[PDB]
Design a binder for this molecule. Structure first.
Ligand SMILES: [Zn+2]
Ligand SMILES: [Zn+2]
Length: 87
């Protein structure tokens, strides 16, 4: 159809899986800090950085995690990595 384009859809919601709208860091990880109030203790920003992620996702620096935001599964092969681990 040629309908998809690099740019997002007209809707472009402010919210996103990649960016936790609550604590700003449970996106990649699990909802653990969401339960706890950030007011009592705000998370320390990581000064160290490398590869400069597309947005601000910490783990994306090492290996991109655009799989969560994208509803459609990549279906890419696991490859050597992600296997043969200790547990
Ligand atoms: Zn969160
Ligand atoms: Zn990510």
């Amino acid at each position: 159809m040629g309908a998809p384009v690099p740019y997002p859809d007209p809707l472009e919601p402010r919210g996103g899986k990649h960016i936790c709208a609550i604590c700003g860091n449970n996106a990649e990880d699990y909802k653990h800090t969401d339960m706890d109030l950030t007011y009592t203790d705000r998370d320390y920003k990581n000064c160290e950085s490398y590869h400069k992620c597309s947005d601000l996702c910490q783990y994306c620096r090492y290996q991109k995690d655009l799989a969560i935001h994208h509803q459609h599964h990549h279906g890419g092969s696991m490859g050597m990595s992600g296997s043969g681990t200790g547990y």
